[PDB]
Symmetry: C2
Subunit: 86 residues, 2 copies
Amino acid sequence: RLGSGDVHKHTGRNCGRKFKIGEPLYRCHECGCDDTCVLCIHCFNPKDHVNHHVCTDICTEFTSGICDCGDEEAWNSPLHCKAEEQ
Amino acid sequence: RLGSGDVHKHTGRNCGRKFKIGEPLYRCHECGCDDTCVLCIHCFNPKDHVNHHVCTDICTEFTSGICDCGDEEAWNSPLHCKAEEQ
Ligand SMILES: [Zn+2]
Ligand SMILES: [Zn+2]
Ligand SMILES: [Zn+2]
Ligand SMILES: [Zn+2]
Ligand SMILES: [Zn+2]
Ligand SMILES: [Zn+2]
């Protein structure tokens, strides 16, 4: 047996979650390679960002925008996905 | 019948969660009345802080420090506890 983890765990791939209208998300000035790099609520790990300038958002329009957790091109440091924590 | 909510829901009182060593937490420059006002991970709601300067922390020492969610003396605006969201 092996217990199941979080349904948002995505070890081995990019998260790719598509945001819905009204859904919040996170940005980090220091970690994001640019101001389009974002993390969904299931992925953002506060432990990765102590003393960083974090800025939340809410998706307010139909977008093809997606969570960049697990996309190393989007981040300046390793992230530790919150959904991987047990 | 009425379904149970989140075990961290604390409608009607202050949260009061005591942080453990290694536990992350949140601060908001604009919302906190001072730099001692904090929110635990179960309470911090990103929807309350769009375009605010949010700063995470990790508790690194034995403290009597506690989450201030639901303590109106600690905040400059109404918060909407994440644990109340269904
Ligand atoms: Zn994600
Ligand atoms: Zn992730
Ligand atoms: Zn960061
Ligand atoms: Zn709390
Ligand atoms: Zn709360
Ligand atoms: Zn705020």
